[PDB]
Homo-oligomer: 368 residues x 4
């Protein structure tokens, strides 16, 4: 039984009238209808899940708002209180860093996003469901313990892992983040903690600018339980699948988590504006198949996918649908971009890609 | 014969936000939307049609020049100007006063260019360099009274232009004719006590503002008799508007003998506008413009300046505006492609209630000395 | 008490092209635009508000089932059905007949789901599984006559539903009440000779179609007297619409004693609609729905099915639709955030011309046997 | 004196309701407001030229519709007649290959696009202007002699080169195409002809799928007078500037054209969805500066830029503005994305990038 979370308000996140930062007349950044992170991209994924007929093979799960207690398992009280404050401003406002704003009442949506991840986690962990996909928005993985960053208000996968640890009593949880940007927030939250293995595959130095190096390995008892796999621009299906086979799956098998949470972004796709990677829907399909099969082998199938980034309203729906189909086992729609993208490359493992991945292999032995 | 035309790229860059009218609001469940009712694309589509139709070849482009503080202070209070500076300097922009309409960051630059476009065109018509013109400005003006912003308006563009004509050009009498479908309350307020600017507003009765635009609002002191409101009922169309022109507006202008006529030219009385219930077609606006231009020829050596006010149909407004431009250039080269569709809907018969609304104003003409 | 609700994702995927009303056309200088007047976002925003408001929790979701050829042929000719198959099979889609409205490629799938959503809801209300419901379908129906598509409509959804109630459920009398602001010419045509479906249309006089909807259009043969048009003047608001309900519509339904009432529920009579000139507010639609639901309770065991027709304000339509949903669920949990803004504009006084238009229809009630 | 062409109708090109191909319900490709190639991207470039104040330093040049005779210098009569036919269809239609459609009356815009390139070429070549930028749409470089392809109806730069050859009597013209996709159309048109040197820098096998190899060198008298520089995905400023210095500028100096036409796309930008390259506005600035200075040295400054592709409505305006500023010499606006993008990389010449460029150096000796 496969759970699926969508909430209407995920599609109502107010991203403003700028492109990335706000529109700014002095800088001559003209207003635009769709910010890069506009919610339509993820809503189109949801609408494809429905229109394709996948929804008939899924068990819809209503999001339940994350409580203050839920949020405080991942974040500081000061951060939570600041998000309450900003959300109460009549226009919304600056969430801290001056780039990403939050719209008025936006905390309601941020709680439903974290809460959708928690609710799905609860149902999968207790055995009500075998697995699922939480198509949440706003995203999570850049928000560290004490701040919002990178379009993220709360770290949804960390709120879910915190819940699995504290409420469900799991001793080991893994978060695998294949969003193309470094999961700095998740890395920060669990830095000193070996009970949550944090893995991030990402384009090297894409975002944030100063993080995601292979030398960032945790601290204290957590040393060895953070794994970064920075990959070069232009990496495609061959690099990603080699990273899965050489690093990710062996790390999960070594760690023996009781639950795998996937921070599932699709911004590594061939058509994404916010990175330079070459993954196709078939690549994401294979990544999901491998991870689901790994869960079947090591943690009784307990795997929860939670939406992170992705910025192609054209193509992201088909990348997401491929993952859904691997969960349901019903493979009923082709990728209509397949012919167009398959000739572009990414399907050969380049020497620089291989080398980037091999850098991480000696770190596997420190996962006890 | 030389017809001025003002468009500035930044008129198309006004940031109207992500709400419909007020801001988006999650608790109220007002979902964000790409195009606010007042989004600048409507007016930009008008500009683009002026160009694509070939009308631009018959126009003399006139660059907007930013309105100075001194220009603005002829229509507005120092406190209002300072408040607009303050709001424009806020990092996200903010509330211009009424709680509904926001102004984006640095937006004062565009407000100055909008008012300044009206001033520049007025200057160049009044000297005789140009015979007439159209200033396709944004943001609009006619709701902003002396001491505030209101109704999407930051500065009262036509009043800044009239103030310039009075103080800098020394004209003794100026008329502002406002056929935007909403009451020109701002213009009325600014010149309330002043007989040297005749203010006329045709509008849908109580459309916006809610408490405003009655025929009993006639000015005060020396200005008593030099404000004329013509409130019309919902559903009024070409017949009503042309009867109002013939019975009230043109006689008022002839009685007053302005040295310059400024037209607050909105197209929100159109048959397809969401923000009013009127039935005017492009041919109606054409006839309104022709009548007014011919009146200017008769009484003030042709000195007429059109200044864009409202209008909210991105589909149809361009053709209403193009009709007015064609009356200025005398080059009538494109049909209204909506003509057949709209002509059958009505508005072309003068209804008794429409006639009566207009006749209410006729006895006030005698007080225009 | 169980209230059915139909939404299908594909209702939001109807491809309305890149024109405003007709296609974009370069020679005519009709610039392309992102949102056609009839773009599906308007109705999708209604659905999203039903969900976000929490109304969805009080509704029983009912899946659309594609209308079969047999379902469609109860309302339409075989030639019409075959033509829609043909057009839907063209690689880009194409002209559905009138030259204005296009249908996108594969669009027949959505037309079948739209009609089928109405049928499914009708079936489940008529059995007593549900007490009532709202089918938020798209594309709309009421302009499509027996032999053609027209006015954005491919199949006449409410007539497909009525045909099902008559032929499959064996109901002897069905009523279709159409308060979309445009004349239900299609529905009128289909049931013209047939007294077993009472067809009532309230509409702005001659809004669309242009030659249609007069009070003299009363049916023919055995159907004479079982079509009722109530043309209303531009500018009519809540007072007119509620007077029409009380003087004409409700008495007609009580005289006829239908076994099921189907409401063609458009919201294009709203105060903010671009495609008509009426002044109805969400509170007006609320009162219209309440009256009709209470009438159904009195005369046909509550069997009432609402089926979405038109409406073109993405800003305001959601709140008009939500008011109707709240009358069905009895859960009144969200204000209309436009109430203050619109309440001052008028429409709340019954004008003499509005009263007279309605009184024209009262003598026709006696012919409903 | 710097010429600048914009025509309102360049912004009115009807790209439909699909993403790339048409919307298609059976494939579950949901309609969308903005096709990848929607004209707003280029219109935003024009509006920035105006709002930045660059327009005050430019001489606006009205487009003049390309005549049949103009078009026939680059294309077959059958192609021209087919475009007339498709343009006359009530909805427009299929321009030949089934992917890119042309809207009704669209031939008018295609003539104004080619004609804008011709008119600017005429004024620069005759000495009325020193240089200029024709911000045209639809684009040109994929249209070969006998067909439309890749959003291109007519090959604008080839129509302009044909005019320079036949009407102005220039013996040698060069077309340098730095659009990220291979200029297959331009390559095809001048394949057998040494009097037009055709150079294309591009992402290897991005589009079209089967072309742009270094082995495509022309034929007959034209052998040696087509130069392809395929570059790997992820190439940025360092690779592009190395290609300019090692291949492009030496090729131009060897050839001694009497006019340089630049097919100026910005789809190699860091934020483009339709390629995987890493060029920033400063990169395009340096490319333009180098090419303009080369023209000053070898052909009395006669250089004409003609817009090709580019698909970031956010960033393309700033890339285009950088080129305009190099033409006017007035450098009055910062790139507001500079900090955000500068940390992402592309500024180091990688071994695979260097090698790709060095593959072309031995071909320079065959340019006589
Ligand atoms: O703002 C940014 C880039 C933001 C990119 C966010 C990606 C978010 C995400 O997809 O991973 C996800 F979280 F949505 F998943 N950088 C700056 C800003 C200022 C100065 C330097 C760099
Ligand atoms: O906000 C509005 C409606 C605003 C309509 C502005 C029309 C502007 C204009 O076209 O005339 C022009 F100025 F642009 F020209 N009403 C309220 C708000 C609160 C309470 C009651 C009514
Ligand atoms: O095309 C139109 C107007 C179309 C308006 C359709 C309204 C559709 C609807 O809301 O009722 C509903 F069906 F969607 F519900 N008129 C012409 C065209 C040619 C000649 C004269 C008039
Ligand atoms: O349609 C495409 C990709 C089109 C990309 C066009 C780029 C155009 C351009 O920017 O260079 C410029 F010309 F605009 F400049 N490929 C297919 C389609 C079907 C099957 C395989 C591949
Ligand atoms: K850890
Ligand atoms: K990651
Ligand atoms: K006055
Ligand atoms: K007015
Ligand atoms: K009947
Ligand atoms: K009706
Ligand atoms: K050649
Ligand atoms: K190229
Ligand atoms: Zn990301
Ligand atoms: Zn107005
Ligand atoms: Zn309607
Ligand atoms: Zn390109």
């Amino acid at each position: 039984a496969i759970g699926y979370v969508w909430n209407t308000l995920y599609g109502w996140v107010d991203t403003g009238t700028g492109s990335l930062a706000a529109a700014n007349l002095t800088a001559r950044m003209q207003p635009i209808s769709h910010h890069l992170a506009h919610p339509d991209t993820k809503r189109r994924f949801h609408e494809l899940v429905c229109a394709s007929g996948q929804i008939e093979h899924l068990t819809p799960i209503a999001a339940v708002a994350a409580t203050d207690a839920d949020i405080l398992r991942a974040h500081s009280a000061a951060h939570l209180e600041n998000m309450k404050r900003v959300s109460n401003l009549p226009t919304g406002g600056d969430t801290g860093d001056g780039i990403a704003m939050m719209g008025n009442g936006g905390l309601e949506i941020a709680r439903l996003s974290a809460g959708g991840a928690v609710e799905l986690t609860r149902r999968v962990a207790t055995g009500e469901l075998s697995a699922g996909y939480a198509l949440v928005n706003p995203p999570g993985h850049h928000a560290p313990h004490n701040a919002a960053m990178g379009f993220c208000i709360f770290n949804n996968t960390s709120v879910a892992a915190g819940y699995a640890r504290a409420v469900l009593g799991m001793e080991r949880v893994a978060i695998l983040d294949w969003d193309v940007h470094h999961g700095n927030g998740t890395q920060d939250i669990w830095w000193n903690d070996p009970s949550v293995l944090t893995i991030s595959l990402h384009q090297h130095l894409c975002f944030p600018p100063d993080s995601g190096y292979s030398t960032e390995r945790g601290a204290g008892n957590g040393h060895g339980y953070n794994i970064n796999v920075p990959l070069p621009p232009g990496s495609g299906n061959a690099a990603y699948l080699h990273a899965m086979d050489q690093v990710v799956l062996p790390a999960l098998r070594a760690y023996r988590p009781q639950l795998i949470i996937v921070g599932s972004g699709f911004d590594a796709s061939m058509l994404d504006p916010l990175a330079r990677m070459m993954v196709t829907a078939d690549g994401f399909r294979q990544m999901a198949r491998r991870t689901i099969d790994c869960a079947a082998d090591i943690c009784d199938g307990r795997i929860v996918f939670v939406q992170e980034g992705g910025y192609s309203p054209h193509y992201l729906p088909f990348c997401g649908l491929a993952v859904i189909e691997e969960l349901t086992g019903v493979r009923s729609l082709p990728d209509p971009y397949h012919e167009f993208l398959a000739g572009m490359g990414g399907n050969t493992l380049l020497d620089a890609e291989r080398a980037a991945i091999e850098e991480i292999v000696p770190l596997l032995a420190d996962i006890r």
